[PDB]
Design a protein around this ligand. Structure first.
Ligand SMILES: C=CCN(C)CCCCCCOc1ccc2c(-c3ccc(Br)cc3)coc2c1
Ligand SMILES: C=CCN(C)CCCCCCOc1ccc2c(-c3ccc(Br)cc3)coc2c1
Ligand SMILES: CCCCCCCCOCCOCCOCCOCCO
Ligand SMILES: CCCCCCCCOCCOCCOCCOCCO
Lengths: 619, 619
């Protein structure tokens, strides 16, 4: 029945593998990357007419009928995103009249204008001089002086926020302005009557931070700020030290862009770090066939390759397949062997993790490290010596990274401070990196492949963690994947791997929940709205990926021979394309619950293959 | 008569000009660059068999009949140089028997072995584990803590020493060892009876420093050194901030190599700066036609271009000659506009100088800046706006760089501290950058071209300086050129340009001295020995360059219609080659009086052309 489906999928994936041996699908996000790029280019005075053109086509192509852009396909119009896409287009050339410009503009206004947008958006505008700097939450260079164990020192923030903050303190310190030509001025973003409905800090705003901020803008005005020179240089140095090998900073769009703006501010455009930072950008861009151009929020080579391998193995290929070997060898060369920021809380921990992108040594993550080590574990590479050793180093690093609550975070250990969530600046996405059910789950399944079970105290503390986090209806949240279907699939699959008993009440209470959400069409789906409003948990148009996740939960829970089970396998077998792949016009990846979603291009092909491989296994 | 010589020199120079518009002859030094390269490669575990081969050819090619190598062609055998060339060859493959290895080994031994070599040499050996680190003068990371106005803070050293020290403190801090394979071990360098005649600090050693060194070696042994981690990071940061655009540090071989070793030490080979540092190296290498390969101590593009222009103009070409315009435009794009280390002593001075190499913004020098600004002054470029502007910024920067005594140093203002000259480490070349007669002279001739004269207080203080420095016999020392002929030519030419009266006693006393040294052949020459022993001042085989310098002195002093004058012009006319160039198997450039000499490849062609142009002018 499905056997042909699997064979078509296996050969499809294999054709997607690059020559070097890895897989790498693009990462989709939203138009703020490209819009911010255009502004970045203006700031750096490096505008390429031809590129601007490709970016316009893309911006438009992404606008919907109503004239707005969203955070995810088929999602509500987003104001920040739309405001930025708007300014970008006006800069590139479009007059405020044009049909597209008109719709967007009115959407923007009906929302309360620019005054209703997030900090970043108003800040970007502040940079080109279309918004007052005084109204932008202040992050001072001096933050650089807080010690390792002090409130709000840069290590209390999550890895992604940390670098962005450091980079920004240099910029906010100078509050620079790079004027837009008159043609692109956007005063009309203020022309509205609607009350400006302002978004506040992620966790709530104590009047302290509010006062403190007012203080800082006050202090900004003084004619002299002692030790500020040093605070700046501390920040600059912090950055020079961590620049990734591709020229980026963290391998993510924000800090990278800001770090470049900061360098420009410090007259360092003639410096190596800048040059390398600037030209590294091309590697993240993507030429779209319809003549457009997009910029990736980040890149997922390692991750893509790790999963690809696991799926192809579960599907049936030999642990020594000359093609999976290319992958294994490649993965071995990726292992990070030097201390990263994680070592501030684990100085005696030997380096052994892996990063998400190609070359980003200071920020390996537990998720990638667990998937890579595990996928390696399932292979037979020529140099069993290195495979043995690498797995070992990786294994140890993971174990050492476990947090207090028994669960793993992504980049740090106990990065659970609640302080940062209340600052006036932090009104967008996550700002700290606490442990999550999905990473913890993946870690568990990794150990599981080795044998380690419930006996080992490590695994026990984790399961304890998971049990305490389970939801009333039996589901598990999805921090990095959309959403409860992602988490629940991850957890149950994990628990099953570490020997727990699938028959337990809480396990069954989950397996039921899965079955109860199956869509009429035989597959499963969960819209991104499920982060915003609970009515959507387990609800949404079916996707190949989310179906594969729900299936894994079932197959792990013994219900592989169920109705819902076979029904789902039907859905995957049917919807498969003639080439062997699948389609997925929806995002199933999570950047930040509620604020940033991602489209993992390979998911639609890898998870179905993985779930089908595990089904063929249960028979 | 000479006119044909002049036309042949002109067309020759023009044929040497690169397409971009500049001139760039290689800079010759000695084999320690290549020998140290080989060791650097071994340390960085990046040995390329083919390159080693080209290097071996070169090293032998440079060895003399006695089996030794020297600091300059036709110079005495140098121990340090020979010891390093020796180890290099043994590493590359040659067995200690071979004719060459034999001769060298006995020379080295007859000198007292390795114990008689400079700090650097023993240090390099310490790095590959063939010499004890305890016996190597110590330079601690903590030096990084000394303030701007404290004894021995890094800004009391000359620019070149400064970066080398900073880079080295990280290395000496870890006292790393990268073992040589048994084949290349060199114990035989100890096998000698001759008493080790040790070289001491350049200025004598106070028992204090000796004590201090012994202290620092003991401190090294302790199990804990508080704040050392920081000193290291202060150093690394100091380094990361100043990396030049080509990946070098300062555009000179020493700090560059050391900075790379330090990053290797700090597990930063995967960092941008390291990679940029490593690949930048190729730009300094040179393929020799006989299959050898050499590495330049530094590169002289700007300098070469600046002089080339002045010579071609003095020769006759139109101030708007399209070929001289390519040069002018190119020179304008070179001007440094950001603060360098010089700003520590001149914070309110607007950037406007030029560097010696292509891209080295933090270290412009007064010599290049005076020659470039002056050459620009003699051209009519399309964008008179920028030429007017560049000259002014440059001019002002020079004026602002003037030191206390009224003369100019090369990179800093009053870098005259005598302290650094007494440390156990500083036993090679210059370590501070005090004002010199030749740079001062060039600066003067630069102002002269604008019309400024003896009336202006700045020029007066300089002439005062020069007069006070003149030698008893009427000659002027040559800090950056070999030697009294170079200086005297520079000063008299300068004084003549700022309006001083050539008839004065001291001027005549010099012009006489010049005539007094003319060789039987009609030209002038001065061997590099003239730094070591005074009997050689103004004596040596005639060279096209030194003849040209003596000529300029005469032509500036009015004796252009003299015997010695016409006689000299004959020499240049006769010895010219058919293509229009000249030959010069001797070095006429000075790195450090007594310790490091340079072969400026373009000198032989540019100065004769410049002197002949000024002769044709005096008629
Ligand atoms: C399933 C597993 C995935 N894991 C391997 C983790 C790697 C996926 C994360 C890639 C998302 O890239 C980003 C990261 C941060 C941002 C931000 C941002 C927002 C607020 C602050 Br303050 C700082 C940064 C914006 O876009 C991003 C994209
Ligand atoms: C006419 C004008 C030339 N001027 C424009 C000045 C530029 C020429 C200098 C190039 C010489 O390059 C170097 C510099 C330093 C060293 C060292 C060294 C010795 C001791 C310490 Br402590 C540190 C470095 C060795 O070789 C060099 C070559
Ligand atoms: C250079 C001194 C050595 C200090 C590094 C040891 C690391 C100690 O853990 C602190 C964590 O700091 C994170 C550093 O990674 C960034 C790059 O720093 C470069 C070289 O150390
Ligand atoms: C970050 C504030 C800028 C402070 C430096 C300007 C002050 C003058 O320089 C003092 C000495 O440093 C000179 C060296 O230039 C090297 C790199 O500095 C680059 C970024 O500041």
């Amino acid at each position: 029945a499905y056997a042909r489906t699997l064979d078509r999928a296996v050969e499809y994936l294999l054709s997607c593998q690059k020559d070097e041996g890895y897989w790498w699908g693009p990462l989709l996000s939203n138009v703020t990357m490209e819009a911010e790029y255009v502004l970045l280019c203006h700031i750096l005075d490096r505008v390429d007419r031809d590129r601007m053109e490709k970016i316009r086509r893309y911006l438009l192509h992404e606008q919907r009928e109503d004239g707005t852009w969203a955070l995810y396909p088929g999602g509500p119009p987003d104001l920040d995103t739309t405001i930025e896409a708007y300014v970008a287009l006006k800069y590139i050339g479009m007059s405020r009249d044009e049909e597209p410009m008109q719709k967007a503009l009115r959407f923007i206004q009906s929302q309360g204008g620019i005054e209703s947008s997030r900090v970043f958006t108003r800040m970007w505008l502040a940079l080109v001089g279309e918004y007052p700097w005084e109204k932008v939450p202040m992050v001072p260079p001096e933050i650089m002086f807080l010690g390792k164990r002090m409130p709000l020192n840069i290590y209390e923030f999550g890895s992604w926020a940390r670098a962005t903050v450091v980079a920004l303190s240099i910029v906010m310190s100078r509050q620079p302005v790079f004027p837009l030509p008159e043609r692109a001025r956007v005063p009309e973003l203020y022309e509205t009557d609607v009350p400006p409905r302002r978004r506040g800090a992620k966790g709530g705003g104590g009047w302290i931070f509010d006062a403190l901020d007012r203080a800082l803008h006050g202090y900004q005005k003084l004619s002299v700020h002692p030790f500020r020179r040093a605070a700046e240089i501390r920040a600059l140095d912090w950055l020079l030290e961590r620049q990734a090998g591709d020229g980026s900073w963290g391998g993510i769009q924000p800090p990278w862009f800001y770090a470049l703006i900061a360098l420009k501010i410090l007259d360092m455009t003639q410096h190596p770090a800048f040059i390398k930072g600037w030209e590294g950008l091309e590697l993240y861009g993507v030429e779209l066939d319809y003549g457009g151009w997009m910029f990736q929020a980040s890149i997922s080579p390692v991750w893509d390759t790790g999963l690809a391998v696991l799926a192809l193995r579960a599907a049936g290929l030999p642990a020594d397949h000359d093609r999976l070997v290319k992958a294994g060898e490649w993965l071995l060369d990726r292992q990070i062997t030097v201390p990263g920021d994680w070592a501030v809380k684990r100085p005696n921990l030997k380096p052994g993790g892996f990063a998400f992108q190609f070359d980003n040594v200071y920020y390996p993550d537990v998720d990638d490290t667990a998937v890579v080590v595990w996928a390696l574990n399932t292979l037979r590479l020529p140099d069993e010596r290195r495979r043995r050793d690498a797995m070992t180093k990786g294994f140890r690093w993971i174990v050492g990274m476990q947090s207090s609550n028994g669960g793993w975070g992504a980049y740090d250990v106990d990065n659970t401070s609640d302080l940062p969530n209340h600052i006036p600046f932090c009104d967008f996405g996550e700002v700290t990196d606490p442990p999550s059910e999905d990473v913890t789950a993946h870690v568990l399944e990794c150990f599981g492949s080795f044998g380690y079970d419930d006996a080992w105290k490590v695994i026990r503390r984790a399961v304890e963690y998971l049990k305490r986090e389970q939801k009333p209806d039996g589901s598990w949240f999805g921090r990095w994947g959309v959403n409860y279907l992602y988490g629940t699939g991850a957890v149950v699959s994990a628990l099953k791997a570490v020997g727990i008993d699938t028959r337990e009440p809480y396990i069954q209470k989950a397996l039921d929940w899965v079955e109860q959400h199956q869509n009429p069409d035989g597959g499963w789906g969960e819209d991104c709205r499920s982060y915003e409003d609970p009515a959507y948990a387990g609800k949404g148009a079916s996707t190949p990926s989310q179906t594969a996740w729900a299936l894994m939960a079932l197959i792990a829970g013994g219900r592989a021979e169920s109705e819902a089970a076979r029904r789902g396998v039907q859905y995957l077998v049917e919807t498969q394309r003639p080439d062997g792949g699948w389609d997925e016009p929806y995002y199933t990846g999570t950047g930040f619950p509620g604020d940033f979603y991602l489209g993992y291009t390979m998911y639609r092909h890898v998870f179905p293959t993985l779930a089908l491989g595990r089904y063929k296994q249960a028979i």
